[PDB]
Amino acid sequence: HRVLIFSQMVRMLDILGDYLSIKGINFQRLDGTVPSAQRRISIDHFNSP
DNA sequence: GCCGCCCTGGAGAATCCCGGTGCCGAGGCCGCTCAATTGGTCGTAGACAGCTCTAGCAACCGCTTAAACGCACGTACGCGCTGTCCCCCGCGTTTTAACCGCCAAGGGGATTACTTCCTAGTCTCCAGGCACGTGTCAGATATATACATCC
């Protein structure tokens, strides 16, 4: 299964991103700072078979 | 034999040190004396509590778009060097007025004490000016419709 993790603060999302970076898990991120082109890129990267 | 010249010793006067006594600056003491202290009373300034409504704040979003930023070029200006000349500085000499010490009388102004009265504080009562909200009204603006006209 694949998992989404929703959060209210993007700094907590940065904390989980660093946790997965040292942990070494292929992760993707989405927040308000990401522009819509990279949003489309990340959604197509996540939804690919 | 008589007179003139060189060498050396003790007593008179100048100076340093110490003690007694008189004068300047400052502190202890005394006397007045007025303002700080103490004690009591009372009114009210402010602390506290309570309710209502509005602004701020942390952290996030999304969109727009104009400002910020980076880079390349070019050229204008800051800066350094050199010349030049002129004007300010240093010094010697002469003048002159600031400074200090003097009249000569008179008014201005600071105090001390006293008298008086006008005016501003305080209190009570009242009313109208200021703040807020609203109905209404005339000027400004936009369009509806009818008449003259060019192609």
Curated annotation (Swiss-Prot):
Subcellular compartments: Nucleus
Phenotype caused by lack of the gene: Decreased sensitivity to the cytotoxic effects of 6-azauracil.
Disulfide bonding pattern of the chain: none
Family label: Belongs to the SNF2/RAD54 helicase family.
Subunit structure of this chain's protein: Component of the 1.8 MDa SAGA complex, which consists of at least of TRA1, CHD1, SPT7, TAF5, ADA3, SGF73, SPT20/ADA5, SPT8, TAF12, TAF6, HFI1/ADA1, UBP8, GCN5, ADA2, SPT3, SGF29, TAF10, TAF9, SGF11 and SUS1. TAF5, TAF6, TAF9, TAF19, TAF12 and ADA1 seem to be present in 2 copies. SAGA is built of 5 distinct domains with specialized functions. Domain I (containing TRA1) probably represents the activator interaction surface.
Additional remarks: Present with 1620 molecules/cell in log phase SD medium.
Its job: ATP-dependent chromatin-remodeling factor which functions as substrate recognition component of the transcription regulatory histone acetylation (HAT) complexes SAGA and SLIK. It recognizes H3K4me. SAGA is involved in RNA polymerase II-dependent transcriptional regulation of approximately 10% of yeast genes. At the promoters, SAGA is required for recruitment of the basal transcription machinery.
Annotated domain remarks: The 2 chromodomains are involved in the binding to the histone H3 methyllysine at position 4 (H3K4me3).
Name assigned to this protein: Chromo domain-containing protein 1
Lineage of origin: Eukaryota, Fungi, Dikarya, Ascomycota, Saccharomycotina
Gene: CHD1
